[PDB]
Design a binder for this molecule. Structure first.
Ligand SMILES: COc1cc(Br)ccc1CO
Length: 119
Protein backbone atom coordinates (compact mmCIF):
# COMPACT_ATOMS: atom_id res chain seq x y z
CA UNK A 1 0.00 0.00 0.00
CA UNK A 2 2.91 2.36 -0.71
CA UNK A 3 1.33 5.49 -2.30
CA UNK A 4 4.75 6.65 -3.63
CA UNK A 5 6.01 3.36 -5.11
CA UNK A 6 4.76 4.13 -8.63
CA UNK A 7 7.52 6.69 -9.23
CA UNK A 8 10.52 4.35 -9.07
CA UNK A 9 8.43 1.68 -10.88
CA UNK A 10 7.87 4.19 -13.71
CA UNK A 11 11.56 5.18 -13.74
CA UNK A 12 12.51 1.50 -14.16
CA UNK A 13 9.90 0.96 -16.90
CA UNK A 14 11.22 4.05 -18.74
CA UNK A 15 14.77 2.60 -18.45
CA UNK A 16 13.52 -0.65 -20.06
CA UNK A 17 11.81 1.35 -22.81
CA UNK A 18 15.00 3.33 -23.54
CA UNK A 19 16.98 0.00 -23.80
CA UNK A 20 14.54 -1.24 -26.47
CA UNK A 21 15.41 -0.64 -30.10
CA UNK A 22 11.73 0.06 -30.80
CA UNK A 23 11.88 3.28 -28.74
CA UNK A 24 14.50 5.01 -30.89
CA UNK A 25 12.02 7.13 -32.96
CA UNK A 26 10.34 8.24 -29.71
CA UNK A 27 13.29 9.07 -27.43
CA UNK A 28 13.41 12.76 -28.37
CA UNK A 29 10.84 15.16 -29.91
CA UNK A 30 10.01 14.45 -33.60
CA UNK A 31 12.44 16.46 -35.78
CA UNK A 32 10.48 19.21 -37.50
CA UNK A 33 13.20 19.65 -40.18
CA UNK A 34 12.78 15.96 -41.21
CA UNK A 35 8.93 16.14 -40.97
CA UNK A 36 8.04 19.80 -41.79
CA UNK A 37 4.26 19.29 -41.66
CA UNK A 38 4.32 17.52 -38.25
CA UNK A 39 2.67 20.36 -36.29
CA UNK A 40 -0.07 20.67 -38.97
CA UNK A 41 -1.33 17.24 -37.80
CA UNK A 42 -0.02 16.90 -34.23
CA UNK A 43 -1.25 19.41 -31.70
CA UNK A 44 0.71 18.12 -28.70
CA UNK A 45 4.12 16.56 -29.33
CA UNK A 46 5.30 14.05 -26.73
CA UNK A 47 8.37 11.85 -26.38
CA UNK A 48 10.04 9.60 -23.76
CA UNK A 49 12.72 12.12 -22.76
CA UNK A 50 9.96 14.67 -21.96
CA UNK A 51 8.10 12.00 -19.94
CA UNK A 52 11.28 11.07 -18.03
CA UNK A 53 12.13 14.73 -17.37
CA UNK A 54 8.58 15.48 -16.16
CA UNK A 55 8.74 12.52 -13.78
CA UNK A 56 12.20 13.47 -12.47
CA UNK A 57 11.19 17.11 -11.98
CA UNK A 58 8.38 15.88 -9.68
CA UNK A 59 5.76 17.15 -12.12
CA UNK A 60 3.59 14.04 -12.28
CA UNK A 61 1.22 13.62 -9.32
CA UNK A 62 0.19 10.05 -10.29
CA UNK A 63 1.10 7.22 -12.66
CA UNK A 64 -2.20 7.94 -14.51
CA UNK A 65 -0.77 11.29 -15.64
CA UNK A 66 2.45 9.61 -16.86
CA UNK A 67 0.35 6.96 -18.65
CA UNK A 68 -1.67 9.69 -20.45
CA UNK A 69 1.57 11.26 -21.80
CA UNK A 70 3.03 7.88 -22.90
CA UNK A 71 -0.26 7.03 -24.63
CA UNK A 72 -0.03 10.45 -26.39
CA UNK A 73 3.35 9.36 -27.87
CA UNK A 74 1.54 6.39 -29.42
CA UNK A 75 -1.57 8.26 -30.59
CA UNK A 76 0.67 10.91 -32.22
CA UNK A 77 2.51 8.15 -34.11
CA UNK A 78 -0.84 6.68 -35.24
CA UNK A 79 -2.15 10.08 -36.32
CA UNK A 80 1.03 11.05 -38.22
CA UNK A 81 1.65 7.74 -39.99
CA UNK A 82 0.84 7.73 -43.72
CA UNK A 83 0.20 3.96 -43.49
CA UNK A 84 -0.65 1.39 -40.85
CA UNK A 85 2.28 -0.63 -42.32
CA UNK A 86 4.90 2.14 -41.81
CA UNK A 87 8.12 1.29 -39.96
CA UNK A 88 7.88 3.92 -37.19
CA UNK A 89 4.20 3.21 -36.55
CA UNK A 90 4.89 -0.55 -36.41
CA UNK A 91 7.58 0.07 -33.76
CA UNK A 92 5.07 2.19 -31.80
CA UNK A 93 2.58 -0.72 -31.70
CA UNK A 94 5.14 -3.12 -30.22
CA UNK A 95 6.36 -0.52 -27.75
CA UNK A 96 2.74 0.24 -26.76
CA UNK A 97 2.02 -3.45 -26.09
CA UNK A 98 5.15 -3.71 -23.91
CA UNK A 99 4.24 -0.49 -22.05
CA UNK A 100 0.63 -1.55 -21.41
CA UNK A 101 1.74 -4.98 -20.19
CA UNK A 102 4.03 -3.37 -17.58
CA UNK A 103 2.06 -0.28 -16.52
CA UNK A 104 -1.03 -2.31 -15.55
CA UNK A 105 0.35 -3.43 -12.15
CA UNK A 106 1.78 0.05 -11.46
CA UNK A 107 -1.67 1.62 -11.92
CA UNK A 108 -3.45 -1.14 -10.00
CA UNK A 109 -1.06 -0.91 -7.04
CA UNK A 110 -1.25 2.87 -6.90
CA UNK A 111 -5.06 2.96 -7.03
CA UNK A 112 -5.25 0.21 -4.40
CA UNK A 113 -2.80 2.16 -2.17
CA UNK A 114 -4.95 5.28 -2.44
CA UNK A 115 -8.10 3.32 -1.59
CA UNK A 116 -6.33 1.83 1.46
CA UNK A 117 -5.26 5.34 2.53
CA UNK A 118 -8.94 6.44 2.44
CA UNK A 119 -10.42 3.22 3.99
C1 LIG B 1 9.86 -7.59 -24.66
O1 LIG B 1 11.05 -6.85 -24.69
C2 LIG B 1 10.86 -5.50 -24.87
C3 LIG B 1 10.08 -5.05 -25.96
C4 LIG B 1 9.92 -3.69 -26.07
BR1 LIG B 1 9.08 -3.00 -27.68
C5 LIG B 1 10.43 -2.78 -25.15
C6 LIG B 1 11.22 -3.26 -24.11
C7 LIG B 1 11.44 -4.63 -23.97
C8 LIG B 1 12.30 -5.11 -22.83
O2 LIG B 1 13.58 -5.46 -23.23
Amino acid sequence: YDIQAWKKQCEELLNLIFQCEDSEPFRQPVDLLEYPDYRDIIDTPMDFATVRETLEAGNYESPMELCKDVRLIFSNSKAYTPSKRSRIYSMSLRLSAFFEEHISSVLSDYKSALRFHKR
